[PDB]
Design an enzyme around this catalytic site. Sequence first.
Site, mmCIF file in Angstrom:
data_model
loop_
_atom_site.group_PDB
_atom_site.id
_atom_site.type_symbol
_atom_site.label_atom_id
_atom_site.label_comp_id
_atom_site.label_asym_id
_atom_site.label_seq_id
_atom_site.Cartn_x
_atom_site.Cartn_y
_atom_site.Cartn_z
ATOM 1 N N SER A 194 47.150 17.960 33.966
ATOM 2 C CA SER A 194 46.110 17.122 34.582
ATOM 3 C C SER A 194 45.887 17.611 36.017
ATOM 4 C CB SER A 194 46.475 15.665 34.462
ATOM 5 O OG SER A 194 45.367 14.851 34.833
ATOM 6 N N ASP B 229 39.392 13.208 25.769
ATOM 7 C CA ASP B 229 39.818 13.372 27.174
ATOM 8 C C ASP B 229 38.556 13.514 28.020
ATOM 9 O OD1 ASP B 229 40.888 14.498 29.671
ATOM 10 O OD2 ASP B 229 42.761 14.841 28.493
ATOM 11 N N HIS C 30 43.889 11.569 26.840
ATOM 12 C CA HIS C 30 44.518 12.159 28.041
ATOM 13 C C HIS C 30 45.978 11.717 28.105
ATOM 14 C CE1 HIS C 30 44.415 14.296 31.756
ATOM 15 N NE2 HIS C 30 44.923 13.255 32.409
#
Lengths: 316, 322
Positions: B164, B262, B292
């Site tokens: 991320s 996501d 995610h």
Amino acid sequence: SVFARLDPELAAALREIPEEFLLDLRDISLARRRLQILREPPLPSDVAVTDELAPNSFDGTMVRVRLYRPSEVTGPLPVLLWIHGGGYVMGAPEMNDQQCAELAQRIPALVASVDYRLAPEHPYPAPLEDCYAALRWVAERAEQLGVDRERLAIAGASAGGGLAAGLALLARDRGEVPVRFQLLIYPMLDDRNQTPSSYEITDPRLIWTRDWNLIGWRAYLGREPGSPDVPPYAAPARADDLAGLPPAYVLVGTADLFRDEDIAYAQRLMQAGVPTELHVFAGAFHGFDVFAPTAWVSQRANAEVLAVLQRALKLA
Amino acid sequence: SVFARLDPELAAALREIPEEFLLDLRDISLARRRLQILREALASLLPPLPSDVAVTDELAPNSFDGTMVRVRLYRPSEVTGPLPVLLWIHGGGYVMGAPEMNDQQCAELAQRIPALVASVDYRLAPEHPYPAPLEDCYAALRWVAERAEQLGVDRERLAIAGASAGGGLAAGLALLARDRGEVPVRFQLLIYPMLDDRNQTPSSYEITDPRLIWTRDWNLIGWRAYLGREPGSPDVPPYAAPARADDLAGLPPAYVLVGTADLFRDEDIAYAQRLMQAGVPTELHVFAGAFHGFDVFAPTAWVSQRANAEVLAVLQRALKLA
């Protein structure tokens, strides 16, 4: 140096191919008879291979469907409709007997491999209507074949993956046969040859070149590649509305002419809300999975195709 | 319904999280607490850290401002010869997290690759905006390379990786390291990287419910904190938002993973495809119906297991002795 962008194991596999064994599409007829002469571990003994015929109401012809039945397994089977490659201009179901028999055994499933007619003798729509006739026959005769009509997957490699993608669109639009899943192995699905990757592969030692791609599409369409208003069933890259298509898996190598069209199609499926897995393999050429099956990357690809088909075709 | 686009096993995992455990980025101090609570819920379900992995803290000098960056080391004991090294960069939207959040993942990678894993304690926004967090990662990378012969590692087998925001920092670090020409990087492993501040892709509009972990609004708050500027401002440096980088040629070979559900789906696919178009060897894997953080929120799901097994297989291959 032609091999410079390849995974080194894949480059080594391609180096062992004699120059005289490479595709030359100057003469389609020779390339075919040369290919079929070329091809010729034995097939699993627990898989029965038979030939059946499916009626095609397009022109009233009969399509040969080659069935691979895992003789061990009990209860109704899911089915995988398999469509072979060869650029729309060559190939036969027999080229994939090994892969189809292995998938029948390991999924497990009835595998139904379509003997579709070839271009240039039979341009679009004939070869796709052959695949549709096979699909319709499996669905209609499901109880007779001992298959679950609700666990029908379609799959193909290269030209066969283009046919599979167009079959999904055509099956969706006709509203007769439900399709559970579509498995597209480096699909040939954009006639326009305008993506960056469509310019990147020009050497015949890399299996499928831009020159071969233009010849294949020209034969299949019976029109120049990139002509206006090519139907979306013929070249699924052109399809505007992908909503309501079957869940998809797409595989392609970075050193494949189709890298960019395959990525764009998978991403557009995702943006239309179609559940889609996309796997791009680093340094992998067109047909890496079957031309170099011992390579680490090929083993990963072949293991993954089996795992996603097992999951997709599994009873609830 | 909010969970409609998810793999059913992943929807089941997210349904189990109480509403009060979810992130609220409208108060960064509260968000840091919510993450501590989530971090505890996840760690609860995991075994203890392996016994044959030594976890220690070292300091890397950062010539950006003369500070020292904590680098958390995970050393597998059973390998006495030279190790490859994985530089790990944690996630948290540029505004939360600490290396300890990935103690389990890093100890398992150290044991299984095997490798020395070096996890960067980068400074957080909004207290320390770009470039400070990236220069912290650069200081850690430089320290591993300079100290390699005393760490007992092979500086020709140095991978960088992150999740991320940590995957954005890893992508930016690959660009910064390429351009400074001091430290060669063998491989970059980007797990659902947060690498476009512009929030203009279709997927950047698709996730608005905090039950799906990272929303458009959380993304805008994180980017605003990291840049010290409105997300999508002109001239955001490519090191800060790698999606904006024009020339990707000569970057390390790459692996990119993202789920279809996501916020980062479309920026991740576009970055991976632009790497491939620049001639960087790149593996891209988009997982169907994956949200995610699916790999850490739902590690027992079939799709999570495939993702975790592939990250290991790819690192083993990238970091093995030729």
